[PDB]
Chain A
Amino acid sequence: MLHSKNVKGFLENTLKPYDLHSVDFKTSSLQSSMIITATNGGILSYATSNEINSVNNLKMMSLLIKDKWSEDENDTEEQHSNSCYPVEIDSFKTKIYTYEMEDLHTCVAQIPNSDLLLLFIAEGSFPYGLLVIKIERAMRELTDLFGYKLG
């Protein structure tokens, strides 16, 4: 089974911004943080930094991101792309893809050996490297959701 409250708390915690103290470099929070399916692309769980219209728009954006990701997961040509960051944690291989949606930076990563995806959307000023590190450290703590498939 699944627990919506703990996943909601995790997605709310992944909306936390960065405030560096050694170097004065403040970053804004992410626009949205959600977990979606790898089959239909609809929202399993979601969280926003800051109502029905935004939920429908976020579902549309999740559908668009999964539609773009489906062809990228099934393509082996041009595999040495600069926007792909395939990380392997705990002997589980996955592929992370970053995309630009007009003025939005959207980073998606398939949870390894499972039919789920994790998506972080931030503003255009957000750096891509910090998003990659954020999604890597987020996937590091999601070992309990490994091997989960839809029924």
Chain B
Amino acid sequence: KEHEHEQKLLAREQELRDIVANTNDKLIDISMINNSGIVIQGTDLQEALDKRQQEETNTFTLLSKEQLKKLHSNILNEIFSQSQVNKPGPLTVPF
């Protein structure tokens, strides 16, 4: 039965070394914070271009006004209306 305990101790040694390696792999230094490179400038068009690059000529040919003029203004107004945020009071209090 002690040989089974020896095998259990070997498995425990492997498990503890795996635990040490796992908790060693998540250590982040300040050099990793300063030079991470994760925070990169991204635009919608560049994100779409990267999506098409990972997934994978002048298509457009040059040839109502009231409806489009109404809908564009209404969409802009509905965008600007929900962005209006009213504070619940003063932000800075005096003495």
Contact = CB atoms under 8 A, between A and B. Distances in A.
* A–B direct touch in complex (beta carbons closer than 8 A): yes
Interface in B67-88: 71, 74-75, 78-80, 82-88
A6 B88 contact: yes
A16 B38 contact: no
B88 A1 contact: no
Contacts of B41: 81, 83, 97-100
A47 to B, nearest CB: 12
8 contacts: A16-B82, A22-B75, A98-B41, A100-B41, A100-B47, A102-B38, A134-B83, A144-B91
A128 B44 contact: yes
B84 A98 contact: no
Given A3-B93, A133-B83, 18 more contacts: A1-B94, A5-B88, A9-B87, A13-B85, A16-B82, A18-B82, A19-B82, A22-B71, A63-B33, A67-B36, A68-B39, A82-B43, A99-B40, A101-B38, A101-B39, A141-B87, A142-B91, A144-B91
A18 B91 CA distance: 25
B29 to A, nearest CB: 13
Interface string A1-14: 11101110110011
A67 B31 CA distance: 11
Given A63-B33, A64-B39, A129-B44, A145 B92 contact: yes
A59 B15 CA distance: 32
A30 B66 CA distance: 34
Interface in A58-91: 60, 63-65, 67-68, 81-83
A43 interface: no
A97 B43 CA distance: 11
B34 interface: yes
A64 B93 contact: no
Contact of A64 (B36, B79, B89, B92): B36
A127 B89 contact: no
Contact of A2 (B38, B40, B91): B91
- Scoring B74, B75, B87, B94 by chain A CB atoms within 10 A of each residue's CB, the highest score goes to B87
- Scoring A5, A82, A100 by chain B CB atoms within 10 A of each residue's CB, the highest score goes to A100
Contacts of A137: 80, 83-85
Contact of A144 (B42, B75, B92): B92
